[PDB]
Amino acid sequence: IKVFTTVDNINLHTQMSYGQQFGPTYLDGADVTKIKPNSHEGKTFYVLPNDDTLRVEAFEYYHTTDPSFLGRYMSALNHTKKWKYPQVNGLTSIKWADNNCYLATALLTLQQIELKFNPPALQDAYYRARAGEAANFCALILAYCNKTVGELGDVRETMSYLFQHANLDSCKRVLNVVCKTCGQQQTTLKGVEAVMYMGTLSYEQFKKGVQIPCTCGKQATKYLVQQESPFVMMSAPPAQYELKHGTFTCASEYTGNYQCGHYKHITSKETLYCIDGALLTKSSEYKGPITDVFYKENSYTTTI
């Protein structure tokens, strides 16, 4: 049966009654390697790279040479295609399934922050996600993050993985630490390290100064001097926090114990919204266990 095989669903290649024929083969998420070619006449078949043309084309689309990627990608795709993606306040979320709470919180965050992905696979799926088709994008996140369906995940970890696979070259951060004995030292962060900070949740507290230790046991302060990024992520261990409307963009809510809780998404619009997969809850002021707060920026210069 004359059929079409592909590695990226972009460049298509036109190739008896699948392992001996093509190797590991997939058709819409399902592993058909142990099947025989009927209704599968002319359909596009995902195959593993086995020639140089497909090996080089696989890097053009996925920017990876790991032979496990496609297998881990189609393995996650079998579940994500069965997931439901409701539109909650103009945003695509995921109904609870296979411990996808941290994935849904990451999907809502990405729809509200500016990010340009370097791999065309992530970028092309990023556009399809905002439109409503978030299956191919959720599976790709699991593949790039080396995570599997059902495994427990962390929002700060998953975002950090994606941030490295994205264009944050123009993102700079000029920090200044001063010591009561050593003196004043200036540091500059560029890329993924310039948009993230684990420690405090308040962007204003980062500007006013945060107490950190130097080589000397004496306490030093670290304050932000210059920031040049479309957004910043502020992270801290889960504690109680009051989120004021208009002072932030979106925030992540973790409830439970280490590697044992449940993630919830909070966003700021005309009023504070709380998304729990397919559920919605409004509030004027919010207070709860917040672990990550996202703030929007463009250019900031300190007064000190």
Ligand X SMILES: Cc1ccc(OCCN(C)C)cc1C(=O)N[C@H](C)c1cc(-c2cnn(CC(=O)N(C)C)c2)nc2ccccc12
Please indicate if the annotation marks 182 as binding a ligand.
Answer: yes
Cβ distance 25 to 47 under 8 Å? yes
Quick one: 112 or 118, whose CB is closer to Zn ion? 118
The residue from 124, 154, 276, 292 that is catalytic is 276
Q: Is 276 a catalytic residue?
A: yes
Segment lying near Zn ion (by CB under 5 A), choices 22-30, 40-48, 98-106, 295-303: 98-106
Please indicate if the annotation marks 145 as binding a ligand.
Answer: no
Pattern 153-172, Cl ion, x by CB under 5 A: ------------x-------
Least Å distance, CB 26 to Zn ion, is 17
71 CB contacts (<8 Å, ≥6 apart)?
Answer: 24, 48
Site size for Cl ion (CB under 5 A)? 11
Segment lying near Zn ion (by CB under 5 A), choices 94-102, 129-137, 194-202, 285-293: 94-102
Quick one: 30 or 216, whose CB is closer to Zn ion? 216
| Reduced 3-state DSSP string for 272-289 | EEEEECCEEEEECCEEEE
Q: Is 145 a catalytic residue?
A: no
Quick one: 99 or 118, whose CB is closer to ligand X? 99
Please indicate if the annotation marks 260 as binding a ligand.
Answer: no
Does residue 117 interact with Cl ion by CB under 5 A? no
Cβ distance 268 to 283 under 8 Å? no
Does residue 129 interact with Zn ion by CB under 5 A? no
The residue from 101, 138, 145, 171 that is catalytic is 101
148 CB contacts (<8 Å, ≥6 apart)?
Answer: 72, 75, 76, 142
10 Å Cβ neighbour count for 157?
13
Rounded to the nearest 10 degrees, the angle between the axes of helix 101-111 and helix 120-131 is: 90
Does residue 118 interact with Cl ion by CB under 5 A? yes
Least Å distance, CB 40 to Zn ion, is 20
Q: How far apart are CA 178 and CA 184, in angstroms?
A: 4
| Half-sphere CA count of 227, side-chain side, radius 13 A | 24
Cβ distance 8 to 60 under 8 Å? yes
DSSP bridge partners of 31: 26
DSSP bridge partners of 7: none
Q: How far apart are CA 123 and CA 146, in angstroms?
A: 18
Does residue 30 interact with Zn ion by CB under 5 A? no
Active-site residues: which are they? 101, 262, 276
Binding site for Cl ion (CB under 5 A): 63, 79, 82, 99, 101, 118, 165, 249, 262, 295-296
Summarize the annotated binding site as residue ranges.
179, 182, 214, 216
Which residues contribute to the site for Zn ion (CB under 5 A)?
11, 63, 79, 98, 101, 118, 179, 182, 214-216, 245, 262
